[PDB]
Structure 1
Amino acid sequence: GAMAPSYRVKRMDIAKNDEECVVNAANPRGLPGDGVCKAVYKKWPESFKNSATPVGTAKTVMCGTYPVIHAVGPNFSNYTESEGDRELAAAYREVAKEVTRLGVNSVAIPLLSTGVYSGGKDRLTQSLNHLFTAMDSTDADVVIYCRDKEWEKKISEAIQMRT
């Protein structure tokens, strides 16, 4: 465990993270994809061997000894708001199981279903709240990665609000 488990947020490429493992915002087919997924494919391509997994699940593959947790959020273009919300919550619960099983003291995590799977809606609060619901009972240091300056400010405020 971390001595004083924390949440932090950084605005940078998650492929440059300083944590003991990474969560990929994966597709269900284990394809290179785009955005975070493409960055993860460039940095850790070995981790895409048999990484395909269904929506709402996470599957860990090692790149050397560095764990890549492939977490598949729903594409809100295809899911109803109700079913997508249930699958997005479930993906983060499977992330928390993997982080715990791996025994890591820190994890780098993007906001699932906020980019090309958002169905064109702002899901910062929805995705971050499901992240907190899953991760709050874990003792890993969590570092959230984002790219947008306004998102950085809103995620940082949400973390500080809980103290």
Structure 2
Amino acid sequence: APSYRVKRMDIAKNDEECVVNAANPRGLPGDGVCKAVYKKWPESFKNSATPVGTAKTVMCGTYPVIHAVGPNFSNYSESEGDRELAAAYREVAKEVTRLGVNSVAIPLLSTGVYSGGKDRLTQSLNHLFTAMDSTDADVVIYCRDKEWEKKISEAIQMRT
């Protein structure tokens, strides 16, 4: 019987079960948790360029790195951007489920990092839930700040 949880786990452990990152489509530095992963794994960033609207898995020797292009729609409108970001989630969930892994650690993205400087706690939640609905594996949403993690936890309590 599958489930979901929230915790705070530094992705730089290298979660063998699955790792997902948000990388700039142009391969420029100044990006999400992908920046941190890159500093451990140069090869992950090597030709990490992938178009918006998709996801690109690469295998860095050990464990697959699913690169996704969500908030990095800064070269795109809000209307198209919602569609492309949604497609990126379906691709992420599809690669995860295809790996057929027991669990998966997914960072939350869509938090304004490259777009027009706005997060949307509700938007990130709904989007993650959509991806999650498209995965059987025991998925964990991973948070960073303590108080922001708390809000996600409130959403979990509110969604049972």
| Partner in structure 2 of residue 41 of structure 1 | 38
Aligned partner of 1:115 among 96, 109, 112: 112
Answer yes or no: is the 8 Å Cα contact 2:54–2:68 preserved in 1. Answer: yes
Q: What are the Cα deviations for residues 2-32 of structure 1, in whole angstroms up to 9, with x where unaligned? A: xx32222223432235451110011113445
Change (3 A) 1:145 1:17: farther
Higher relative contact order (CA 8 A, sep 6+): 1
Is contact 1:22-1:107 (8 Å) kept? yes
How many Å apart are 1:62 and its aligned residue?
A: 1.0
- Cα distance change on mapping 1:121 and 1:107 into 2, 3 Å: same
Counterparts in 2 of 1:5-154, with a 5 A limit?
5-16=2-13, 18=15, 20-75=17-72, 77-154=74-151
Give the SS at the match of 1:99: helix
Q: CA deviation at 1:85?
A: 1.7
SS in 1 for 2:56: strand
| Structure 2 contact 25–72 (Cα < 8 Å) conserved | no
TM-score by length of 2: 0.86
| Cα distance in 1, alignment partners of residues 54 and 138 from structure 2 | 22
TM-fit CA distance, 1:61: 0.9
What's the secondary structure of 1:130's corresponding residue? helix
CA contact under 8 A between 1:72 and 1:91: conserved in structure 2?
A: yes
- Work out whether residues 32 and 41 of structure 1, in 8 Å CA contact, stay in contact via their aligned partners in 2: no
The verdict on how the C-alpha distance between 1:22 and 1:43 changes in structure 2, with shifts beyond 3 A counting, is same
Q: Which runs of 4+ in 1 moved over 6 A?
A: none
- Larger deviation: 125-134 or 73-82? 73-82
Structure 2 unaligned residues grouped into runs of 5+? none
Distance 1:44 1:6, change over 3 A: farther
The aligned length equals 160
Tell me, what secondary structure is at the counterpart of 1:77? helix
TM-superposed CA distance for 1:157, in Å, is 1.6
- Quote the RMSD (CA, aligned, Å): 2.1
Q: Which moved more, 1:117-126 or 1:70-79?
A: 70-79
1:108 CA displacement: 1.1
Is residue 75–residue 119 contact of structure 1 (8 Å, CA) maintained in 2?
no
TM-score (norm 1): 0.85
Is contact 1:49-1:61 (8 Å) kept?
no
Shift of 1:115: 4.6
Consecutive unaligned residues of structure 1, counting only runs of 5 or more, are none
Q: Relative to 1, partners in 2 of residues 1:65 and 1:75: Cα closer, same or farther, differing over 3 Å? A: closer
Cα distance, 1:65–1:76 mapped onto 2, change above 3 Å: closer
Please report how far the alpha carbon of residue 67 of structure 1 lies from its aligned counterpart in structure 2 after TM superposition.
0.8
Superposed CA deviations along residues 44-83 of structure 1, whole A, max 9, x for unmatched, are 3322343321012111111223111001114364433222
